[PDB]
Amino acid sequence: MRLLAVFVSSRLSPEDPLYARWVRYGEVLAEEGFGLACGGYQGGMEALARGVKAKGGLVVGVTAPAFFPERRGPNPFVDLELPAATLPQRIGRLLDLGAGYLALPGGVGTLAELVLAWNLLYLRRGVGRPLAVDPYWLGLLKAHGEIAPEDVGLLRVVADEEDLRRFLRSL
Numbered sequence: 355m356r357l358l359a360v361f362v363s364s365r366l367s368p369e370d371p372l373y374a375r376w377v378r379y380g381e382v383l384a385e386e387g388f389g390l391a392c393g394g395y396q397g398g399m400e401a402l403a404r405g406v407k408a409k410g411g412l413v414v415g416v417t418a419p420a421f422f423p424e425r426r427g428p429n430p431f432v433d434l435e436l437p438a439a440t441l442p443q444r445i446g447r448l449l450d451l452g453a454g455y456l457a458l459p460g461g462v463g464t465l466a467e468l469v470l471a472w473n474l475l476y477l478r479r480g481v482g483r484p485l486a487v488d489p490y491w492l493g494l495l496k497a498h499g500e501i502a503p504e505d506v507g508l509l510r511v512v513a514d515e516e517d518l519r520r521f522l523r524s525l
Contacts, residue, residue, distance in 0.1 A: 355387075355388075355389050355412065356387075356388055356389070356452075356453040356525070357388060357389045357390060357391040357412075357414060357451050357452050357453060358383050358388045358389075358390060358391070358452055358453065358454055358455070358456060358522060358525075359390075359391040359392070359448045359449065359451055359452030359454070359455045359456075360379075360390060360391070360392050360398075360399075360402055360455070360456045360457075360458060361392075361393075361448075361455065361456070361457045361458065361460060361464045361467035361468055361471075362376065362392070362393075362397065362398030362399060362401075362402065362457075362458035362459065362460050362464060363397045363398045363458070363459055363460040363461065363464065364393065364395055364396060364397040364398070364399065364460070364461075364463065364464075365396075365397050365461075366396075366397035366398045366401065367397075368401070372398070372458075372459065373397075373398070373401045374401075376398045376401040376402050376405070376458060377401045377402070377404050377405040377408075378405060378515060379402060379405060379456075379458075379515065379518055380401065380402040380403060380404060380405020380406040380407075380408070380409075380411075381405040381406070381408055381409045382405075382515050382518055382519060382522075383402075383405075383406060383411070383518070383522060384405065384406045384408075384409030384410060384411030385409055386519055386522040386523065387522075388411070388453075388522060388525075389406065389411050389412035389413065389414065390402055390403060390406045390411065390412070390413045390414065391414045391416065391448055391451035391452050392413070392414075392415060392416070392448075393415065393416060393417065393418075393444070393448075394414075394415020394416060394417040394428035394429065394432050394435060395415075395417065395422070395425055395428065395429060396425075396429060398458055398459075398460070399415070399429065400429040400430075400431060403415070403429055403431035403432060404431050406431070407431045412433050412434075413431055413432050413433050413434075414432070414433065414434045414435075414436060414451060415428040415429070415432035415434070415435050415436065416436045416437075416438055416444050416447045416448050416451070417435055417436070417437045417438065417444075418437070418438050418439075418440075418441065418444045419437050420439055421441075436451075441463075441466065445466065445467050445470050446470075448467065449470065449471055449474070449482070449483075452483060453483055453525045454483050454484045454485070454486070454521065454522070454525040455467075455468075455471045455483060455484070455485045455486065456485075456486045456487070456488075456512055456518070456521070457471075457485070457486070457487045457488065457491055458488045458490075459488055459490040459491075465491075465494075468485070468487065468491065468495075471483075471485045472485060472495075472505075472508065472509065475508045476505055476508060483525075484510060484521070484524065484525060485508070485509060485510065486509070486510040486511065486512040486517075486518075486521045487509050487510070487511060487512070488511075488512060488513065489511060489513050491509075492506075492509075492511070495509070
């Protein structure tokens with residue numbers, strides 16, 4: 355089985371319209387034959403996990419307990435927990451788990467994951483895997499100095515469930 359690693363907001367509230375959209379994204383990736391690799395906590399991670407479980411898919415959660423003692427453990431929808439001790443280690447595990455990556459809206463932590471995956475594609479040596487981003491990120495990541503338009507062009511865009519299915523089908 356293959357997994358889609360998703361990076362997303364940890365603070366997203368269930369009442370936020372995006373929460374419901376990500377639950378649907380979870381259902382869709384499961385329907386497309388994929389499982390989910392995520393940070394294993396709340397916000398968008400739980401929204402995605404709920405959708406995947408609703409469709410019988412598998413959810414892997416790469417947690418970081420040392421950094422969040424306040425977070426009792428992975429959300430209820432995580433099947434396998436893979437606790438990481440450092441941020442680079444956590445990110446490295448998510449990247450190695452997924453056949454492709456999707457960066458949904460989030461903060462600095464989500465950006466860290468996005469940029470490391472981007473970095474692998476940027477090396478242009480056949481390392482890493484396809485990376486898609488929600489349009490949200492293009493409002494921030496743009497050509498600038500040594501970051502060329504072509505580098506930004508390595509980022510694929512997934513704005514809705516149809517884009518998501520096409521992305522997954524290309525992995």
